[PDB]
Amino acid sequence: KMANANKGAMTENADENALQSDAKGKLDSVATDYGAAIDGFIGDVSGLANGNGATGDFAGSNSQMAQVGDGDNSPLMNNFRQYLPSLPQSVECRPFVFGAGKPYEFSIDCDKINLFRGVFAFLLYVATFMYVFSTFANILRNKES
Amino acid sequence: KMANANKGAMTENADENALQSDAKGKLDSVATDYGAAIDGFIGDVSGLANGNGATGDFAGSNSQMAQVGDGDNSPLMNNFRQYLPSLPQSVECRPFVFGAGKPYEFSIDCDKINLFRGVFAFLLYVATFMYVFSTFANILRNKES
Amino acid sequence: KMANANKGAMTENADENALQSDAKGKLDSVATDYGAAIDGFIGDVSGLANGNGATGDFAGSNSQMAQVGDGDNSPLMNNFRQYLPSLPQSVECRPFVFGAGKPYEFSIDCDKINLFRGVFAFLLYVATFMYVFSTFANILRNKES
Amino acid sequence: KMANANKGAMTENADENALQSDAKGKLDSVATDYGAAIDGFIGDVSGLANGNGATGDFAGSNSQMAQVGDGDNSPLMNNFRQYLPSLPQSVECRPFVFGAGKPYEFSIDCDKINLFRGVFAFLLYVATFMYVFSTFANILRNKES
Amino acid sequence: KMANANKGAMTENADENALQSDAKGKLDSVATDYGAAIDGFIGDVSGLANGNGATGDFAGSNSQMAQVGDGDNSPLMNNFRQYLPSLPQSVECRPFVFGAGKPYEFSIDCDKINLFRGVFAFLLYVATFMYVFSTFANILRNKES
Amino acid sequence: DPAKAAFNSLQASATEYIGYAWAMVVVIVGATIGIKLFKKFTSKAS
Amino acid sequence: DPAKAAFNSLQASATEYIGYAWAMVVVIVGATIGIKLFKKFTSKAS
Amino acid sequence: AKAAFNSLQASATEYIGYAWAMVVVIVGATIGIKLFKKFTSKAS
Amino acid sequence: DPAKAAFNSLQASATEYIGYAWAMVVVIVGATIGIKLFKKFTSKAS
Amino acid sequence: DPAKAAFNSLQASATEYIGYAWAMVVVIVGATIGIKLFKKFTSKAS
Amino acid sequence: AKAAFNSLQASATEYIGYAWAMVVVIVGATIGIKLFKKFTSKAS
Amino acid sequence: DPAKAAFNSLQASATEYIGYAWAMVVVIVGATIGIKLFKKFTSKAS
Amino acid sequence: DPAKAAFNSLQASATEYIGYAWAMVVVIVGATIGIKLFKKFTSKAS
Amino acid sequence: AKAAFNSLQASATEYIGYAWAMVVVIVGATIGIKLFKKFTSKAS
Amino acid sequence: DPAKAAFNSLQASATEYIGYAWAMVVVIVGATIGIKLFKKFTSKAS
Amino acid sequence: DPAKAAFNSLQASATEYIGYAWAMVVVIVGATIGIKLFKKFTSKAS
Amino acid sequence: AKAAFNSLQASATEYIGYAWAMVVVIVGATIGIKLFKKFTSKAS
Amino acid sequence: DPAKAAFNSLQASATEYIGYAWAMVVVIVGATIGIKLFKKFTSKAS
Amino acid sequence: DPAKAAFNSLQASATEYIGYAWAMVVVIVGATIGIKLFKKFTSKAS
Amino acid sequence: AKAAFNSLQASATEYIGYAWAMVVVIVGATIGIKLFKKFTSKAS
Amino acid sequence: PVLLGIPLLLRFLGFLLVTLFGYLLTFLKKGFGKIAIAISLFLALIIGLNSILVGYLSDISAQLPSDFVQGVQLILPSNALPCFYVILSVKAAIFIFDVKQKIVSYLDW
Amino acid sequence: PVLLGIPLLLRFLGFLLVTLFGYLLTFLKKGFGKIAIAISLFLALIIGLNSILVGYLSDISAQLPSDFVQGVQLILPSNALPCFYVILSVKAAIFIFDVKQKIVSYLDW
Amino acid sequence: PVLLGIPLLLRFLGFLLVTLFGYLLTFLKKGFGKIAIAISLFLALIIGLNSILVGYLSDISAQLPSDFVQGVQLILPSNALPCFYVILSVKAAIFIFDVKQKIVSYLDW
Amino acid sequence: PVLLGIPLLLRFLGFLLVTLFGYLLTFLKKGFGKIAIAISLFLALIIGLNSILVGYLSDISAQLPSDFVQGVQLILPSNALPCFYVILSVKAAIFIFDVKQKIVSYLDW
Amino acid sequence: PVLLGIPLLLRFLGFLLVTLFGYLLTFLKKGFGKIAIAISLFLALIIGLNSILVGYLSDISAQLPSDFVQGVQLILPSNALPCFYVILSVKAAIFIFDVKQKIVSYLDW
């Protein structure tokens, strides 16, 4: 059988289950690194956004995001509080006396000042409430709030 | 015929209709998963947008989108209604009497108060109508409305 | 010539001009569908934009775009016209008579009312012209107009 | 040497420097068209932007961009100039005479009118200068200017 | 052994470690250029942004970015300073004398002018502080600041 | 004594004059207040 | 008594004046409202 | 004597009647002008 | 009795004076109202 | 003395007038505040 | 003589009493009208 | 000399009149200032 | 009668004053309108 | 007697004529100044 | 008759007084109008 | 002379009134400034 | 004769002294009320 | 002639009265102008 | 005649008053303009 | 007789001269105060 | 004149390329459908907002009383209502221009 | 009728294509998960901001005094509170419209 | 010195690569045409809006009466009309700057 | 049971695929580094702007005089300073919300 | 120990990969050049707009008269001009911050 001799001369025993397994193993061992990198980027950006934190390339922005602050306490904003103008603290009403000790001595009875103080407080609330309501209603709109 | 023997020694019977069918079957069985994933993402985002609902990864945003609300009833906005300032309810006009029982007793006839109330109602409408018209006209513009 | 016999045993006559032609024919017959789909999408979106119309997936938005309107006649905007507040129509000036028939009978001569009406018309124009000019000048800016 | 005969029977003389050269020549002859198309698109858009001009697909927008104008002379804007309201041209001050020829004849000395005209000119400048300064400072902000 | 002769006739000694090494060497020698180009673009844009500088294609924008300026000293903005309106420099208060030398000679005591100057300075601060605070609070919002 | 009766008569006349004047001034002040309030309310409304 | 007749005549004259004044003030108020509405439209537009 | 006093009293009352008939007209005109000016000013 | 005729003559003179005064005051008040309304309308218009 | 009694009566009348004036001014102030609040809402909205 | 002076003094004081009783009413009415107008104007 | 005593009595009467007038004017001016300040504060507040 | 002649002369003088006042008020109104228009432009621009 | 009364009546009317001719000028000047001030104030 | 000449002299004196008063009032009113117009124009300008 | 003493007393009284008026006007001015500042904040916020 | 004139002159000056002492008080009160009203109005 | 000396004395008294009145009015007008300017400046400032 | 001299003196005094008033009103107008300019800057900024 | 009338006429004119010399000062002071107040009010 | 299996290999390569490019075509059509869905949702949201806004105006409707008509007609010039209608027309034109520009911008998806 | 190794080569090519396309599918699912995470974060930020804003209004609360009620009721027309509520409803509708439009725009990721 | 079919296989591979890259070139040209169409539509919309806006101003035109000219000329300084024209020129410059910046931004498509 | 060279060809194909996919991984990491650099630059710019703005307020500082305190205390209600502080807190909350939303939007790079 | 043509086929495959990846590199460099051109055009447009705006201010220039200086100096506090200059400096800082942020955003092209 010369056919058998020629076939044996130009033939190498190759197994599909070996070559396929090796190729798939290498491809998986590198695709796992690919997926790990993608998931790491996603986790870093999410942690920066929600305050959990970031590791790796984004670790340097942790200090900056902590300086920005969360909730309503912004350390970047609190710098302006040191220069905030000083304003008087509201106290009880004291009547003002004109010409004290003289025959023309009259004083503001301060009974109507309290009524004015009540209506002023009401107006200040209605203004602040409307401001906050419009502030929340126009968050997606690129407007000052 | 040594030619025939050598040809038979180094030949394997392979059918195109088998290899092509197998490859196409595997490729289709995975491309259907690809298309199903794409369509599932599209359906989830559309359901979140129009209020139908989402399943899978976006199922967690169903609660948030239900809290946002649809139409004009926003449960996120209705929180402010509890703190809404109280305002008097409009009633019929009552004349005001100055110095009741005295020789200088005069009262506001309240006949012109009704005319003023009518013109005030007209002005309040023209303001609200213009506000709503401009609100709808400037929806795509990033402006408060 | 055993060489010739062995060569004939393991040789099949294949023509480049046939395999190349078949492959190119199939690839072109599918790439024409690709290009047709791209051009159809482009035409549909352009027709929706400029009012020519769309066919296929975008055919459902034809009704919505017709409801939006073109030029300045918006059927979506014309809904507000039904609730438009009624305002008096401008007519010629009629003098107002005080105390008609009495010894103290004086009337507004309405000669200066026409001069005021002219200057008022001029002011209303200069306001509307400036509004329209600024409206057109700030179309790309995301501002109310 | 049967080995030599069999080797000669199933061997064709192929040169690497020919097949490689042919493939690279075809690929370069089509990649040059690719690069030429990319550069043509870039040049067309740049010419439309800076007023140099465009050729090819973008040639149709040359008329539109010329109608828009460059510098500050916009033919689209100059259409409004025809309807611009007419305003008086500033001239020298003429005193106004009350009761000319009568014993109660007094006239505005127009000495203080010139001082008022100077301060009015100053105020108009400070307003226009501030407007232009804020206009340039808020070009990237989507605000009216 | 004719099998050995036929095997030797149609066999060339090829080493995997040579072909693999050559292919990987060429691919790496071009991928290093790819990565260098990407990193060069990144560095150029970052240097333009933070004022470090750019080299290559972006080198032409170095002059423009230097003209824009950094910090708060903008050479583009300093052009307006030459045309800035001239305003008086604040000095100490000088009383104004009416009818000097006449029996009706009275002068503004300028004691209350200083109190008004203090309260005016306070109001100007509270306005400027609020303006700066809102300016910083609305930097991401597309609003004038 | 006629003087006492005369003084009483003048006092009664003055009282009736005061009554008429009070009526007229009440009417006038009421009209003035009504007009003023109407003008103020309309001015504030628009 | 002539005094009461004169006072009643004065009161009637005052009432007529009040009616005419009410009519004229209503007209002038309408004019003011019209001016403000038709200027506010354009002003708020811009 | 008594007749003279009676005649003087009658003539006095006749003149008072005329003085009142004059002063009513004068005062009415004055008050009319005053109220006219006041109300035309208030209405405008 | 000349006094009655004299009183009637003075009354007629007072009546004609009242007529002239009414004419003049009507003219003056009309002009004042016109000027005031013109100024108010122009001030509100701009 | 009649003078002091008259002065006290005048003072009491003034006090009554002051009380009534305070009530009426409070009412009118409330009306003004209501007008401004319900116009400010719509005006600020637009 | 002395009795006449005493009677005149008494009658004078009686008339002063009546004059005061009249002027208090007149002045009260005038001041009332003035204050009424002033306060109704101030309150509105 | 009765004239000196009469002058002193008139001076005392004038002084008591001045006292009563001062009391009344203080009351009136206090009320006026209170009303004016209330109106001004409310007008500025809204 | 001199009285009617004097009254007519006064009326004519008043008419002349009214005409001159109308001219001057028109001029001043034009000035006010010009000031407001040329300040409003720049103010609304910014 | 009668001639004296006639002369007195004539002289009286002559003086009335002069008094009227004076008062017309005085009143005209006063009213002119008043109206001038009023209208120059109203127009401005 | 000295009375006629005296009346003429008083009339001439009154006429010259009227002339002087007219000159002074023209000066005063001109200054007042100038100041008022300056203040109004400046207030409207800013 | 009594006249100069009375004039000096009047001047001293005027000076006292001026001092008290200055104090009261300072207080009222402070109140007005406070009202405007605390309303301007909220108003400008919205 | 001369003594009567001297007494009348003295009595006249005594009364002038009293009239001045009264008018100073009256005028002071009037001016005080006027200035009080004016300044309380100006300050508010 | 005592009349001439009396006239001179009254003229001197009038002159000193004028001096005192000038001093007092200067003080009053200065205070009024100061208060008015303070109120105006503060009102414009806020 | 003393009358014309007095009238000329009064006119000269009025002219001096007018000049001083013009100077003072110019100063006060400058102050008002300065206040409005330096408040408008900050106000328009925000 | 005639000399008495001449003396009375002369004395009358002398007094008129003094009355004018007084009234000019008084009126000048009054008008000065009035104009001062008016112009200081108008300028501010 | 080639060994066996070469034509079969070439046919297999062509078949693989055709199948892959057909998959690409299917995914492209899916993307176009996604774009159409997005445009439809955007326009539907606009229409719904319009419907809600138009409904609110029925309740609060009010009219100018019979009075005040005389004064308004006394002062009203000939070009007041035309100016108001021009403003409304400008508002509508800008609205539809914005909508069409958004539709144009949907070409980048 | 082909040489040995051709079917094995074709099977290897098919296996390589299947593995690569499966990797592509996995990466696509990762991207979809990223989009879902982004949407969740955006909505959570909105909800947190709302919570903070609602809390501030408790402290500064104030009420109109008993006085001034008479005048307000004296003047108040029948359509004042309806207008105020219409304005508030318009504010809420615009807010939810903006939120839904942003959700729609998330289709381009 | 190679077996038969290797050169034919290499030629087939080159032909496949050339055909695929030509398809890519055609699709790139299609995309460029799409960008050009988008730019044309955007500019056409702007021009149409301008045409509509210019037309409205003809009807409502009005002029200042003959009066009020004297006062305006009495007060008008030398730099009022120049300031108004400077404002208009600034408006036009900003408009064309925005248009050109949008054209530049179209480079990212 | 295959000819020589088939296993070597398959190994070469696998090696080529591995090398190309490793290059893709390296480029992906480069892109992630670019995104991190961009975020860092953006936050640094914000911080620098804040530093400059805080510095300006030192020079122009001024205080309310001792006077005017009595009137302000006379009128000031109990909820004025709380309202002012609520406004400031709202400003700060909106600022940090905008910053966090921009950080979230950086997920699309 | 392999048949003839296998090494030549492998060399051809490597050559094809190298040529394709070089084409990709060339296209990447073209894209970077496009980005640089866009940035240059944007900055040039800003500079040109600045040049035009600075030129207009020469004509309309005016100065405060000699009068009104006394009153302004009478009232002017010590911190008015510093406040005005602080406002101008804030305007300039915000402008350059916006420009730099746009330059940063050009990293996404």
Numbering used by the authors:
A (entry chain R), B (entry chain T), C (entry chain K), D (entry chain F), E (entry chain A): 262 to 406
F (entry chain W), G (entry chain V), I (entry chain M), J (entry chain P), L (entry chain Q), M (entry chain L), ...: 5 to 50
H (entry chain N), K (entry chain X), N (entry chain I), Q (entry chain S), T (entry chain D): 7 to 50
U (entry chain Y), V (entry chain Z), W (entry chain O), X (entry chain E), Y (entry chain J): 2 to 110
Question: What text appears in the publication on this structure?
Answer:
Filamentous bacteriophages package their circular, single stranded DNA genome with the major coat protein pVIII and the minor coat proteins pIII, pVII, pVI, and pIX. Here, we report the cryo-EM structure of a ~500 Å long bacteriophage M13 mini variant. The distal ends of the mini phage are sealed by two cap-like complexes composed of the minor coat proteins. We further performed local refinements of the mini phage by dividing the particle into the top, middle and bottom three segments.
Our reconstruction of the bottom cap reveals a pencil-tip-like structure, where five pIIIs and five pVIs form a sharp cap enwrapping the pVIII cylinder. Both pIII and pVI have a hook-like structure with two long helices (helixLN and helixLC), located at the N- and C-termini of the structures, respectively. In addition to these two long helices, pIII has a short helix at the N-terminus, and two short helices (middle short helices) and a long loop situated in between the two long helices, while pVI has only a short helix in between the two long helices. The N-terminal short helices of pIIIs assemble into a helix barrel, maintained by hydrophobic interactions and hydrogen bonds. The helixLNs of pIIIs and pVIs tighten at the bottom of the cap and alternately distribute with intervals, forming a sharp-tip like helix barrel. In this structure, the helixLNs from pIIIs are located at the outer positions while the helixLNs of pVIs occupy the inner positions. In the sharp-tip like helix barrel, the outer surface of pVI is predominantly hydrophobic but contains two positively charged rings that are formed by R12, K30, and K31 in the helixLN. However, the helixLN of pIII is rich in negatively charged residues, which are in close proximity to the positively charged regions of pVI and shield the hydrophobic surface of pVI. The middle part of the pIII long loop forms a β-hairpin structure, rich in aromatic residues, which inserts into a pocket formed by residues of three pVIII helices from layers 21, 22, and 23. However, in comparison to the interactions with pVIII at the same location, the interactions with pIII are more extensive, indicating that pIII may be able to effectively compete with pVIII for binding the pocket.
